[PDB]
Structure formats: C-alpha cells, structure tokens
Amino acid sequence: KVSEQLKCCSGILKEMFAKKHAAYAWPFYKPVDVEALGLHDYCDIIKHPMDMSTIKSKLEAREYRDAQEFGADVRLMFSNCYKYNPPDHEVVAMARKLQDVFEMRFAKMPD
Numbered sequence: 006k007v008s009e010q011l012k013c014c015s016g017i018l019k020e021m022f023a024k025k026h027a028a029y030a031w032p033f034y035k036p037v038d039v040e041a042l043g044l045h046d047y048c049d050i051i052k053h054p055m056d057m058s059t060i061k062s063k064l065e066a067r068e069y070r071d072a073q074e075f076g077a078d079v080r081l082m083f084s085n086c087y088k089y090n091p092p093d094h095e096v097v098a099m100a101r102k103l104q105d106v107f108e109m110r111f112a113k114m115p116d
C-alpha cells in the first residue's frame with residue numbers, strides 16, 4: 006500500500022496528461038525523440054533525460070520512495086528543457102505553462 010501523497014502524485018500526473026493542458030503538455034508526453042528531431046548533442050548536454058511517460062512507469066512500478074522523489078523527476082524534465090533550449094523558445098514557454106500546473110497541485114497536496 007502506497008502513501009496518500011504518492012496516490013495524489015498519480016492524479017497530478019493524470020491532470021498533466023488531460024486534454025485541458027494538451028496544447029502545451031504534448032511535447033513532454035514521451036522521451037525527446039533525439040533521432041527524429043536530429044539532436045546529436047542532447048544526450049551530451051542532458052545526462053538524465055526525463056518525460057511524463059517515464060515518470061508514470063516509475064510511479065506505478067513503485068520506484069519513488071515519496072512524493073518528493075516524484076517531484077524531483079517532474080522538475081528534472083522541466084530543468085532539462087530549460088538547460089537545452091534557448092530561454093525565448095516556444096518549447097520553454099510550453100514547459101513553463103505545464104510547470105505552473107504541476108507546481109500548483111504539488112503545493113496543495115495534503116500532508
């Protein structure tokens with residue numbers, strides 16, 4: 006049986022995948038497709054790639070000890086996007102909208 010916090014994490018993630026936020030979430034649904042996009046330097050600048058599908062597998066497979074480890078992976082996904090891409094890029098604008106959704110739910114998660 007998993008903590009009440011880890012259960013709320015599953016609902017936060019689900020909200021991130023909801024149609025409501027799809028217009029900015031969709032680039033984060035799966036691993037960055039480095040071959041298709043032609044990003045030869047990605048795995049050299051980003052040592053720990055992360056996306057919402059990897060986080061969902063890790064969550065459900067009970068690989069997070071707690072909500073804080075779940076949040077560190079969501080934030081690593083955003084950090085990677087902010088590290089790799091120019092500050093004024095649209096994909097960064099999209100990351101920032103999805104991050105706002107996440108930050109707001111993560112903070113309102115009961116103790």
Ligand SMILES: CCS(=O)(=O)Nc1cc(-c2cc(NC3CCNCC3)c(=O)n(C)c2)cc2c1ccn2C(C)(c1ccccn1)c1ccccn1
Nearest residue numbers: 031032033034035036037038039042044086089090095096
């Ligand atoms: C679900 C994961 S995926 O399968 O890997 N899909 C996609 C992922 C991403 C993506 C790209 C990043 N960086 C690149 C670096 C090079 N310059 C462009 C941005 C990034 O950091 N993340 C997190 C996601 C862009 C995608 C698609 C599909 C289309 N596009 C882009 C490039 C695109 C291609 C063609 C037409 C329109 N848009 C795009 C660019 C900007 C915003 C959204 N998509």
